[PDB]
Amino acid sequence: VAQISPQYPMFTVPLPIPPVKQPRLTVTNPVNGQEIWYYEVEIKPFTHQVYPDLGSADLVGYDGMSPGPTFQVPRGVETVVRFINNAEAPNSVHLHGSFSRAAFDGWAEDITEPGSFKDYYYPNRQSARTLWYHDHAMHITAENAYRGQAGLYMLTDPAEDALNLPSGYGEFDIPMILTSKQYTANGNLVTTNGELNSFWGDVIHVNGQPWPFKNVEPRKYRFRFLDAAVSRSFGLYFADTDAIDTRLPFKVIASDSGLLEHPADTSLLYISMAERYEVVFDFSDYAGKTIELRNLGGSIGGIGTDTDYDNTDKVMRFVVADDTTQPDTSVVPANLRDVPFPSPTTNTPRQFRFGRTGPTWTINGVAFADVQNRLLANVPVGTVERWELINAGNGWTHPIHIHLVDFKVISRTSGNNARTVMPYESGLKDVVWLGRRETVVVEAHYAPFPGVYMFHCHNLIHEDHDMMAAFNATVLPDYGYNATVFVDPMEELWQARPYELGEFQAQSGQFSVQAVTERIQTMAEYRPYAAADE
Ligand SMILES: *[C@@H]1O[C@H](CO)[C@@H](O[C@@H]2O[C@H](CO)[C@@H](O[C@@H]3O[C@H](CO)[C@@H](O)[C@H](O)[C@@H]3O)[C@H](O)[C@H]2NC(C)=O)[C@H](O)[C@H]1NC(C)=O
Ligand SMILES: Nc1ncnc2c1ncn2[C@@H]1O[C@H](COP(=O)(O)OP(=O)(O)OP(=O)(O)O)[C@@H](O)[C@H]1O
Ligand SMILES: *[C@@H]1O[C@H](CO)[C@@H](O[C@@H]2O[C@H](CO)[C@@H](O)[C@H](O)[C@H]2NC(C)=O)[C@H](O)[C@H]1NC(C)=O
Ligand SMILES: [Cl-]
Ligand SMILES: [Cl-]
Ligand SMILES: [Cu+2]
Ligand SMILES: [Cu+2]
Ligand SMILES: [Cu+2]
Ligand SMILES: [Cu+2]
């Protein structure tokens, strides 16, 4: 249908790379003598000239930019990130892909008001994967995400590095953070506020830039795809501009939770909100060509309901040079890793139904705000469980996120007989897309930390009104590991604290080296992540 946003100059601005986010300092952990990387992130308003010939867009972002700066963390280095609210509305930060303790996982009610800051303690012990950090605050997630509180967080393993995949952030390892927005005549953002069905957007962005180009060498690139959009699901394919309907093959090498067991040979990638897929594309056969990254129309080929616009079939262009600077020495092994799949269970699955109760998006007819009713499951830590995620509806689709766990997609049924399980769903994931009339069974090990945790739809419109609920990953009082201070997300010890702008800019009081050191050494003594130690 006709584009509503003004006419944009297609493929004329080059793809931005979020900078890598540098720690302020490191703090000796008294427990193990190791260095904890400490960072400061300032959430603040800024403007961006999106449309060269028009007004500015008002955004609010991690360190005054969208996407946020990219985190790059080796497995086994604990990080502490002080997320500092200097904006107009509260925040709650969720590290999506992290088995963070309940109080460091971005619980929607665990907010930071402006003039406050919260310290998040992350383990960084999981399998190498593309994580992303984003706002999760009660009822205001859609707008906080859309206005630009989302950035990448790369968990790296030297073992993954010995597979010799195309490498180097900004070089042959490219973040591909997709968003779908709408602009006014004056080129500001159209707000998602008061939207209750879906906010599709008619302007496609990669890393915050509408319809970019990148100049590439005719060799393999590692592409880290993330759908950071509010509501748009995609069917990605690449075509030579000479033949825009001819889909070029590529390999999926990883899903949400990290590497597949084997690359999945693919020509069409389904990706919905909050899904991460890592692709290797070989430009070597296309020396001298423009490859266009495109999106499947017909609401992702009849899997979705998304409205398509004049230009939502276009993502960005790759202008392929005649030659490499030096040889491409990277490969893609047939065997990437042994995926730590959960031990299969025969226990009867739980059922969660994603639908409507009048004007409200619900799970089992419950809204997240209905505190009484929203804790839908108690799972003993260690348990493997199958959840059957049900979309009975033809008029909505629901990418379901479970916090804490990595899961195996066991099965997909479709009431429009459209598809089953996809080859790139062969590994471990933390989001799975319920297309039209789709039921999906996932299997997860609810481990290793006890806590109250969220699960929900990642269509941020639906999440906010109000398709979210909670599970309790439970232990008996004799469990120890200080479980009593890490099970309740709203525990006083880990709550936001106020600060003054002058303290923050001068690196004094609470931001002295000394205070930051004392505060993080105190946190470390509680040993939040000990039970994972292997
Ligand atoms: C999520 O599940 C956890 C279990 O992992 C629940 O925490 C448990 O809460 C009960 C009471 O809330 C605690 O037992 C109590 O101990 C004191 C004596 O020291 C006494 O006042 C009570 O009679 C009772 O025996 C239990 O220790 C605690 N477990 C842990 C490990 O903290 C938690 O309540 C659940 N959250 C929700 C929202 O359901
Ligand atoms: N996006 C939406 N927002 C609100 N209501 C919707 C939406 N899409 C569909 N509905 C309504 O919700 C109900 C269920 O929609 P659904 O897609 O299941 O409809 P259907 O085609 O009639 O399927 P069935 O015959 O199995 O009910 C219907 O009353 C429909 O009109
Ligand atoms: C739970 O948290 C407490 C609070 O930090 C830990 O207590 C510390 O333990 C170390 C080593 O035993 C001592 O040297 C500290 O002086 C303790 N501080 C306090 C206030 O008690 C405790 O070890 C943690 N327990 C577990 C099981 O992880
Ligand atoms: Cl059930
Ligand atoms: Cl110990
Ligand atoms: Cu998320
Ligand atoms: Cu998450
Ligand atoms: Cu939904
Ligand atoms: Cu979430």
JSON list of C-alpha atoms and ligand atoms in Angstrom, two decimals, residues 136 401 403 456, ligand 9:
[
{"chain": "A", "resi": 136, "resn": "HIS", "atom": "CA", "xyz": [11.68, -3.50, 29.04]},
{"chain": "A", "resi": 401, "resn": "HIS", "atom": "CA", "xyz": [10.18, -14.86, 24.07]},
{"chain": "A", "resi": 403, "resn": "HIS", "atom": "CA", "xyz": [13.52, -15.18, 29.59]},
{"chain": "A", "resi": 456, "resn": "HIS", "atom": "CA", "xyz": [5.74, -12.70, 26.37]},
{"chain": "B", "resi": 9, "resn": "CU", "atom": "CU", "xyz": [11.22, -9.72, 27.66]}
]
